[PDB]
């Protein structure tokens, strides 16, 4: 029964601290929230299963930050904003498979191969991060400072190659 409470303990703390910090430098502050919660407090005990919660929570924060960058990206992408996603997701690649969401999207993705290679060549995350790279996020990266175009090479192959 104590094992059941330990499993449910790591479970409810996993979803708790997971969705707690679920809501650049703010993700680096979330990586500093990954410092204070995981890499300082939880690192003392778990060089184990926080190593599993490097997958079960933190690559589930690359799955969760994946789908956060893959739901529908309104205006958080540009030549600086998605370059700040390199300060978020390629900074999540600072440690070994989390180079996903800043790949093939960080440079104001609004091209045919930026959308279609945001689907087929922005991998290690889910492939919903093309419509949230060049369909919402190139009418929205085109709506962002450092615009690159609301193309149908962007929006059509981003809403088509992904979906």
What does this molecule look like?
- The chain is mostly helical and 163 residues long.
- Helix content is 50%, strand content 0%.
- The protein has helices at residues 2-20, 26-42, 53-58, 60-68, 81-86, 113-120, 131-139, 152-158.
- The PDB classes it as exocytosis.
Structure described in brief:
This protein has 163 residues and is mainly α. The chain contains eight helices and no strands. The chain has helices at residues 2-20, 26-42, 53-58, 60-68, 81-86, 113-120, 131-139, 152-158.
Outline type: elongated
Order of helices and strands: HHHHHHHH
The separation of the N and C termini measures: 45 Å
Q: How many individual β-strands?
A: 0
List keywords for this structure.
1 chains; 163 residues; mainly alpha
Set out the fold topology.
Blueprint: H1 2-20, H2 26-42, H3 53-58, H4 60-68, H5 81-86, H6 113-120, H7 131-139, H8 152-158
Helix pairs in contact: 6-7, 6-8, 7-8
Subcellular location: Cytoplasm; Cell membrane
Protein name: Exocyst complex component SEC15
Family: Belongs to the SEC15 family.
């Amino acid at each position: 029964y104590l094992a059941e409470s330990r499993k449910l303990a790591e479970t409810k703390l996993i979803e708790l601290i997971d969705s707690k910090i679920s809501d650049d430098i703010s993700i680096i502050d979330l990586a500093q929230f990954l410092e204070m919660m995981f890499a300082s407090t939880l690192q003392n005990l778990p060089y184990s299963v926080q190593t599993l919660l490097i997958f079960r929570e933190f690559d589930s924060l690359t799955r969760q930050f994946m789908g956060l960058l893959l739901h529908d990206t309104p205006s958080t992408i540009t030549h600086e904003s998605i370059m700040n996603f390199e300060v978020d997701v390629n900074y999540l690649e600072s440690i070994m498979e989390l180079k996903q969401c800043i790949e093939l999207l960080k440079t104001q993705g609004k091209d045919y191969n930026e959308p279609e290679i945001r689907l087929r060549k922005y991998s290690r995350i889910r492939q919903e991060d093309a419509a949230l790279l060049l369909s919402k996020i190139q009418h929205f990266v085109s709506s962002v400072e450092g615009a690159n175009g609301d193309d149908t090479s962007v929006m059509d192959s981003s809403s088509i190659f992904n979906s």
